[PDB]
């Protein structure tokens, strides 16, 4: 559409971060974290992104 | 009064199966919703929809 | 500024428990007997093994470790297991991890209890940081996490016997016995 979809956007330059309601928390005990899966992979994305900026 | 058709009458072994009605009469009318979906919860032990 | 409250509104008491209810929810005051929101949050329903995580040191993530029988990893297993084995060199990754893995090996071998066996290993991670006359020997402060780890019950000790086991039972054990007394009196 040029307006809503340019081919240059099928490639991810800037990645949107989904808020806390998509990826909730709270646990089973009540003295520790109890996190979500998406968050984990987002942390993995960040580490992989930080170590890259490091080398360059 | 007598019954116009005689009946098949005699002892027969019957087992009492589990799953009794009282163990199944779930009924909810708005209650605890899930965190992720804000949709009612599953199972009757949690009072679900 | 974060203020969170359930005050009834109609007859402020400042403040009282409103009930969690059983089915209806919403915490209606036994005072104005009104409502507050809809609740809709089951805390009993935590993520089971069937996602939850109980981290004690920093934050656990994980990477790779592919094994799903769909397409064989072979070439790609080594592509990613090498690539993740390169990354655990960027910012002092080794230290805490090496300490906790070597920690679970020394305790498991003597069969130290997990509930309090792991408790003392948290104490070591608090003792490895902070700089108070450690004269750190690695093995030395490990005999502190071998004592408090056996503090669950007298699982293997008889702490003196586990001291008489292996190496360093003397002056270097003295430095360590002191460190524990200083850590206990530390609020
Ligand atoms: Zn009230």
Q: Give me the DSSP letters along C108-172.
A: HHTT--HHHHTHHHHHHHHHSSS-SS----SHHHHTTTTTTTGGGTTSS--HHHHHHSSS--SHH
Give the ranges where B1-49 is alpha helix by DSSP (H): none
Counted across chains A and C, CB pairs separated by less than 8 A come out at: 42
Counted across chains A and B, CB pairs separated by less than 8 A come out at: 3
Show Cβ contacts of residue C108 under 8 Å, excluding neighbours closer than 6 positions. Answer: none
Q: Let me know: does C34 contact C7? Beta carbons within 8 Å.
A: no
Number of Cβ within a 10 Å radius of residue A36: 19
Range(s) of the domain holding residue C139: 72-187
From the CA of A12, how many Å to the nearest CA of chain C?
A: 21
Provide the resolution (angstroms).
3.8
Binding-site annotation: residue ranges of C for Zn(2+):
8, 11, 29, 32
Per DSSP, the three-state class of A45 is helix
Show Cβ contacts of residue C58 under 8 Å, excluding neighbours closer than 6 positions. Answer: C96
Q: What's the CATH number where C114 sits?
A: 1.10.472.10
> Which is nearest to C18 in space by CA: C32, B20, C50?
C32
Backbone angles phi, psi at B33, to 5 degrees: -100, 160
Q: How was this structure determined?
A: X-ray
C-alpha of residue C44 to centroid of ligand 1, in Å:
27
Q: How far apart are CA C34 and CA C30, in angstroms?
A: 8
From the CA of C139, how many Å to the nearest CA of chain A?
A: 29
> Which is nearest to A25 in space by CA: A13, A37, A15, A43?
A37
**C-alpha torsion B27→B29→B30→B33, nearest 10:** 0
Check if B31 contacts C (Cβ < 8 Å). Answer: yes
Chain C residues with CB under 8 Å of B32 CB are 23, 25, 39-42
Backbone angles phi, psi at A51, to 5 degrees: -65, -25
**C-alpha torsion C65→C71→C75→C77, nearest 10:** 0
Partners of residue B33 on adjacent β-strands:
B40
CA C150 remoteness from chain centre: 18
């Amino acid at each position: 559409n040029e307006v809503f979809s340019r081919p240059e956007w099928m490639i991810l330059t800037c990645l949107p971060v989904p808020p806390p309601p998509v990826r909730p928390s709270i646990s089973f005990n009540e003295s520790q974290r109890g996190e979500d899966d998406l968050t984990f992979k987002l942390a993995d994305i960040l580490k992989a992104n930080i170590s890259l900026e490091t080398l360059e | 009064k007598k019954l116009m058709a005689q009946i098949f009458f005699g002892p027969t072994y019957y087992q009492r199966l589990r799953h009794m009605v009282d163990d199944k009469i779930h009924a909810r009318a708005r209650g605890p919703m899930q965190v992720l979906t804000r949709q009612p919860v599953e199972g009757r032990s949690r009072d679900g929809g | 500024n974060l203020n969170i409250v359930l005050t009834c509104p109609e007859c402020k008491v400042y403040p009282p428990k409103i009930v969690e209810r059983f089915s209806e929810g919403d915490v209606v005051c036994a005072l104005c007997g009104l409502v507050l929101s809809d609740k809709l949050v089951d805390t009993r329903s935590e993520w089971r093994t069937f996602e939850a995580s109980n981290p004690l040191l920093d934050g656990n993530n994980l990477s790779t470790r592919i094994g799903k029988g769909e397409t064989t990893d072979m070439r790609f297993t080594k592509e990613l297991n090498k690539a993740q084995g390169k990354n655990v060199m960027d910012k002092k990754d080794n230290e805490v991890q090496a300490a906790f893995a070597k920690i679970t090996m020394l305790c498991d071998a003597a069969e130290l209890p997990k509930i309090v066996k792991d408790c003392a290993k948290e104490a070591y991670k608090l003792c490895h940081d902070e700089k108070t006359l450690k004269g750190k020997s690695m093995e030395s402060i490990m005999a502190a996490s071998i004592l408090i780890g056996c503090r669950r019950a007298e699982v293997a000790r008889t702490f003196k016997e586990i001291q008489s086991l292996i190496h360093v039972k003397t002056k270097e054990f003295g430095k360590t016995l002191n460190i524990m007394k200083n850590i206990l009196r530390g609020k």
